[PDB]
């Protein structure tokens, strides 16, 4: 049955010799955002404000919601209310003990956080970060309308193949005022953050309150036997974190950083920013194949050997 | 024809069992640069100045040219000249409209940027970044002479193989005053930035004006049947971005960041730096093989099966 | 010998069709530490202090020891003692010559660093970084007791498989007060830095003095023929760097960064921090297999073909 083995080699790509992809990614974010709060007045956020890591290859972080604590100085200080931190006598707090909250290290004497309750005195940057819910709606909801240009460049080493996701039919005039869309502009690398989140069956406005990790995946599945015109990337978007709050720890995505200031007196103070944002991971993978005689001959020989079993079984 | 199948197994590595490489890279940049300009006077740039991401594993950024806008404050403000931003009456500017330039959000009234023309007021950090060409020659042309030490460590999991690119015939005395060169010192990991760019058929002085992305690739192709003395990495360098300006968007490589200052009055100002630099991507790939009986037997059986087809064809 | 080929296919996974893993990692470090020195007095280090890269996906840097040079102003200056920088006359120093130390560029005249010796004047930030060993024991030795939560998410594209390292049998109540331990809590992702370093046959206290690169590796070896309950990651830890000082360059792991301040007079000063820390690399790899008819048939045919050689050899 030469037809059977021929069809098997045709559809299983057994005659193919395959190789992996070596990729480079560069993303640039463009947009502006306006915030209007009592504390910050009226404010605008340029490209240098809402991208906390200014440029890291492979991913980017877009700040969406955020909490500030200003004028923090190292001092002995009160503690946030907590059942493990309540004071009934000066002997309750253990000198030098380190707690799981991580606000600071305890001391012997303890002071009153307020008139009603007293908590252990700790060494820390005070005033401490107030334990409050993040603002809703998010400050940077305008980050729904940002754009991101993703430039990709792959190489297949063994076959000596180089390619970029910007197809050569496209020109700069079209790319200046272009926006990606599956129905209209499938070849445009300039995505919209709102579209990226929406195509993963999510809502950006709800996501931005606590953040989340979103992955953008690009598939480079190119058949090098056919000309390079059919070597085209395919874009997919997925949500990487977990919605369910009963299984994971610290739902959402956020992190803390600081800005250090030196006063006129020489004392060092710091402003602590806790930022929640959407982190976009760019993942590139693929596998490309070419023609080779030796695998074809090996597969043909093995198929003809299996034809012996086919005949033996047909005999019975 | 046992000779044919034997030679096929010998050269095609059908008897081989292959595995991929798990790698780690660490790079240190050493050098100094001096600049002499009217705005900054005479200046020297240490290791902490021209490497904007201080240490990220896998790649590093070397600043070469820059545009600085100092003492930027939040304010209602003028707009850079642009055909879409020209004022003929106060009703031209749309309240709250967001433009594609991204300098700021528009307001109702508009003032004169200069005596000749008037542009819409915007909420923004001002004075705005002036639209000017980057300085030529670049400020950090001395970055042609920097050195970079690349320490690489690979592991093949299945075969339990660990290796480092620093060969054990080398000692610290040689590596203290060493530099890489194909003809003289091929085993030295200490490359020169000018040499790295030159080996890719590029000119550092021209390309540093607007930047570019270079990839430094290391190939770990080791045959574990032979002793480990033949497991040696191979270095290659190539240019990742595109020179041609009529196909891509925003030619070159650059990014913007900010330094935030607090005045005596408490108002917050920022210095906006737009830096054009050379980003070096370190990409490590390879595949190592070892002897295995089962693939050898399978290939031998398939070859002997194909000998049947060979005999059948020879009969005709 | 159908039994032989059957056993070969059973144990060699010949019938399997394999695919690689596409992974994402997220690490959160929790802990607090106190330092007591003459220069810094009594100090506490929060999450925003000892993690110099605030959040980079795939690795994190935990500061352990440091050298601070404060109030550095750009000016003409003296030089650190060095046999290549000693002065016997004003003609010894070469104007504009760039040295291998990298402290600064030389000038014509040279000045007495101290009463005993004189060195070349250089343009640099001063006072220069004093050449002294890092403090022992390290300032941030308390970083032995920190915790790190590692959340992993893998996908196999061809088989359409998605998984996380947080098993469904685990709940948030257990994960709130959990810690990893091989004997007691093997499914907990919350590791301890001291445990991570210790299980690599290292001591944290001696390693933190000069730092080092530690690799945390996760293996996702899942057989998809069996249910997903057997798809479980496996954790291993290695010491990536080299202890031997006679083969490598700059033993340990450290890097330099700066904090820029603006004085009242408008002059710009900077504080230069040289930080030694432990860099933890998270490397995720794996390979998953499923059942496919065509490889099974090909392997069976080749085995039956090799049975011919088996019979021929047995005949002799
Ligand atoms: N784009 S940036 O230069 O990297 C940058 C942006 C911001 N964002 C804000 O300040 C937002 C804000 C504005 C006004 C008041 C309060 C908050 C803060 C610090 C920044 O610097 C770095 C650099 C490296 C790592 C890190 Cl964590 C920070
Ligand atoms: N090597 S560094 O510490 O990371 C660093 C270097 C510079 N470079 C300059 O200031 C050059 C300069 C000097 C004087 C006037 C004008 C320009 C600026 C800020 C830096 O800090 C960070 C840290 C993380 C992310 C980012 Cl975007 C920045
Ligand atoms: N967690 S952080 O925001 O990223 C951060 C932490 C620290 N660490 C200290 O200041 C320790 C210290 C405290 C007091 C006196 C002397 C030293 C310094 C600067 C920081 O900012 C960046 C941001 C991006 C890149 C870089 Cl290199 C730095
Ligand atoms: C409390 C406050 O400042 N409110 C104003 C609001 O009246 C105004 O319409 C808006 C325009 O941007 O800016 C904000
Ligand atoms: C406007 C305001 O809150 N100012 C306070 C200041 O009175 C206090 O002395 C300082 C603590 O160092 O914190 C800040
Ligand atoms: C898909 C599409 O419209 N592509 C356009 C093409 O129509 C146009 O002729 C060209 C201008 O040179 O720019 C590009
Ligand atoms: C504008 C200015 O300061 N120019 C001087 C230049 O005349 C001198 O030759 C050089 C020597 O380093 O230093 C700089
Ligand atoms: C020398 C110079 O340009 N100084 C100006 C200052 O007059 C102005 O007040 C400030 C903006 O607040 O920007 C800066
Ligand atoms: C290629 C080369 O010259 N390698 C040198 C070797 O000649 C010298 O004996 C040794 C000193 O121990 O340092 C290394
Ligand atoms: C020189 C100095 O600062 N010594 C103090 C010591 O008196 C005190 O008992 C200890 C507790 O934190 O901290 C340190
Ligand atoms: C306490 C101390 O050392 N202060 C000095 C100051 O006197 C000097 O003017 C400055 C150099 O600009 O360096 C600092
Ligand atoms: C291994 C282990 O103890 N797992 C615990 C389980 O015993 C407990 O019943 C459950 C509470 O819902 O949390 C989890
Ligand atoms: C995004 O832009 C559209 C139209 O330009 C506007 O209707 C929408 O409100 C914007 N999104 C946000 C969050 O403001
Ligand atoms: C690099 O150094 C060489 C000699 O040390 C010198 O001739 C050359 O001009 C230097 N490069 C630059 C850009 O100054
Ligand atoms: C870590 O904690 C244990 C107990 O909580 C303590 O015995 C040990 O001294 C701590 N390590 C350091 C370096 O302080």
Residue numbers in the entry:
A (entry chain C), B (entry chain A), C (entry chain B): 43 to 358
What does the paper say about this structure?
P2X receptors are ATP-activated cation channels, and the P2X4 subtype plays important roles in the immune system and the central nervous system, particularly in neuropathic pain. Here, we report the cryo-EM structures of the zebrafish P2X4 receptor in complex with two P2X4 subtype-specific antagonists, BX430 and BAY-1797. Both antagonists bind to the same allosteric site located at the subunit interface at the top of the extracellular domain. The overall structures of the zebrafish P2X4 receptor in complex with BX430 and BAY-1797 are very similar and show a chalice-like trimeric architecture with each subunit containing a relatively large extracellular domain and two TM helices, resembling the shape of a dolphin, as in the previously reported P2X receptor structures.
In our experiments, BAY-1797 inhibited ATP-dependent currents of both zfP2X4 and hP2X4 with comparable IC50 values of 0.14 µM and 0.24 µM, respectively. Furthermore, both Asp91 and Lys301 are similarly involved in BAY-1797 binding, despite the structural differences between BAY-1797 and BX430. While most of the residues involved in BAY-1797 binding overlap with those involved in BX430 binding, there are also specific interactions in the binding of BAY-1797. Finally, the chlorophenoxy moiety of BAY-1797 protrudes into the center of the receptor and forms hydrophobic contacts with the corresponding portion of the other two BAY-1797 molecules in the trimer. From another perspective, while the configurations of BX430 and BAY-1797 in the zfP2X4 structure are very similar, BAY-1797 has bulkier functional groups deeper in the receptor that mediate the BAY-1797-specific interactions.
